[PDB]
Design a protein around this nucleic acid. Sequence first.
RNA 1: AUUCAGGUGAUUUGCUACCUUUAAGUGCAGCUAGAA
Length: 162
Amino acid sequence: MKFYTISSKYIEYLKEFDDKVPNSEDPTYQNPKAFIGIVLEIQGHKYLAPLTSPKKWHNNVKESSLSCFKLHENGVPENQLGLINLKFMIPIIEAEVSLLDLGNMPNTPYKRMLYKQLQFIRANSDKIASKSDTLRNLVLQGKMQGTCNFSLLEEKYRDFGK
RNA sequence: AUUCAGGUGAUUUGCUACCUUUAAGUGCAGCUAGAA
Ligand SMILES: [Co+2]
Ligand SMILES: [Co+2]
Ligand SMILES: [Co+2]
Ligand SMILES: [Co+2]
Ligand SMILES: [Co+2]
Ligand SMILES: [Co+2]
């Protein structure tokens, strides 16, 4: 899995169909919204999930949760690093998506954080993919709500270029 | 941004483990010290 950004035009397009699709741009944002690198690939779709910074309510999400996967530094639990918001993952088109170029990125603190995140994500990549798969299954079955409408998004997204 | 998914224990509070590919109650705490 890897860090991506997604183009606004694409986000705005999907937002037409489901407003739960994550916000991509904001003046308050110090860096572009980052997503995680192919969390589910099924039925010919590729999903990315948005990362989000710590908020108070996160304290109540249990490891067993399908909506959220909490991030923290390997071996250092008190260093919370936000969470992957699986319930707002979205199918993507490769041309509307773009890997962060960490190699050319200046050595800021944010970069350091990205690397504490990556190491944790990588060590848990399977857990993450498995939660994504079960999340979407439950949503197809009508067993879970308050997530992006995966069927609807899956239905319109390849029409973006039109 | 979008403010805690449901469930597995003849009992089950917290966290955790487990199941959700239809199956699945483990572990640490807490509480208990009972009697065949
Ligand atoms: Co780490
Ligand atoms: Co750890
Ligand atoms: Co639950
Ligand atoms: Co099932
Ligand atoms: Co059924
Ligand atoms: Co178990």
